[PDB]
């Protein structure tokens, strides 16, 4: 019913815990995107989707020490929700040097931040 006529863009094995629409900002320019948290193989992983004109690029960014989500701060992994209402976060790790992301949808931001925060909180 809720599923589309064709397999979803996200991995089949992946279990999208939460899905939200955000915007990826980069020094030279920005580009609309979407942040989706999913659990695969009993592990937590964050998938970043870019609304690229060509095709939705699938970026697999596993959640762990290498992956960090800082909410408008140098390193505020413990707290992220406190800064609701248009939340801006930054991701840095082996997969990517540094990229910015934002979610203007507060209601959606709560689920995204809560799910992602819980994932990192549980790991560390």
Curated annotation (Swiss-Prot):
Q: Which residues form the PH domain?
A: 6-124
Q: Which positions does the motif Clathrin box 1 occupy?
A: 78-82
User: Could you say which tissues express the protein in this record?
Assistant: Brain, skeletal muscle, heart, kidney, lung, placenta and fibroblasts. Expressed in the retina and the retinal pigment epithelium.
Q: Which domain of life is it from?
A: Eukaryota
Question: Cellular location of this protein?
Answer: Cytoplasmic vesicle, Phagosome membrane; Early endosome membrane; Membrane, Clathrin-coated pit; Cell projection, Cilium, Photoreceptor outer segment
Q: Where is the signal peptide?
A: none
Task: Tell me how this protein assembles.
Answer: Interacts with APPL1, PHETA1 and PHETA2; APPL1-binding and PHETA1-binding are mutually exclusive. Interacts with clathrin heavy chain. Interacts with several Rab GTPases (in their GTP-bound forms), at least RAB1B, RAB5A, RAB6A, RAB8A, RAB31 and RAB35; these interactions may play a dual role in targeting OCRL to the specific membranes and stimulating the phosphatase activity. Interaction with RAB8A modulates OCRL recruitment to cilia. Interacts with INPP5F.
Q: What does this protein do?
A: Catalyzes the hydrolysis of the 5-position phosphate of phosphatidylinositol 4,5-bisphosphate (PtdIns(4,5)P2) and phosphatidylinositol-3,4,5-bisphosphate (PtdIns(3,4,5)P3), with the greatest catalytic activity towards PtdIns(4,5)P2. Able also to hydrolyze the 5-phosphate of inositol 1,4,5-trisphosphate and of inositol 1,3,4,5-tetrakisphosphate. Regulates traffic in the endosomal pathway by regulating the specific pool of phosphatidylinositol 4,5-bisphosphate that is associated with endosomes. Involved in primary cilia assembly.
UniProt lists the family membership as follows:
Belongs to the inositol 1,4,5-trisphosphate 5-phosphatase type II family.
Quoted from the entry, the domain comment is: The ASH (ASPM-SPD2-Hydin) and RhoGAP (Rho GTPase activating) domains form a single folding module. The ASH domain has an immunoglobulin-like fold, the Rho-GAP domain lacks the catalytic arginine and is catalytically inactive. The ASH-RhoGAP module regulates the majority of the protein-protein interactions currently described. The ASH domain mediates association with membrane-targeting Rab GTPases. The Rho-GAP domain interacts with the endocytic adapter APPL1, which is then displaced by PHETA1 and PHETA2 as endosomes mature.
Q: Which disease is it linked to?
A: Lowe oculocerebrorenal syndrome: X-linked multisystem disorder affecting eyes, nervous system, and kidney. It is characterized by hydrophthalmia, cataract, intellectual disability, vitamin D-resistant rickets, aminoaciduria, and reduced ammonia production by the kidney. Ocular abnormalities include cataract, glaucoma, microphthalmos, and decreased visual acuity. Developmental delay, hypotonia, behavior abnormalities, and areflexia are also present. Renal tubular involvement is characterized by impaired reabsorption of bicarbonate, amino acids, and phosphate.
Protein name (record) = Inositol polyphosphate 5-phosphatase OCRL
Q: Which residues of the full protein are shown?
A: 1 to 119 of 901
């Amino acid at each position: 019913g809720p599923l589309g006529s064709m397999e979803p863009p996200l991995p089949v094995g992946a279990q999208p815990l939460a899905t939200v629409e955000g915007m990826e900002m980069k020094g030279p320019l920005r580009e609309p995107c979407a942040l989706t948290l999913a659990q695969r193989n009993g592990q937590y992983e964050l998938i970043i989707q870019l609304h690229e004109k060509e095709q939705h690029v699938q970026d697999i960014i596993p959640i762990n020490s290498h992956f960090r989500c800082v909410q408008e701060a140098e390193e505020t992994l413990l707290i992220d929700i406190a800064s609701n209402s248009g939340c801006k976060i930054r991701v840095q790790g082996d997969w990517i040097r540094e990229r910015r992301f934002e979610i203007p949808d507060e209601e959606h931001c709560l689920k995204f931040l809560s799910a992602v925060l819980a994932a990192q909180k549980a790991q560390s």
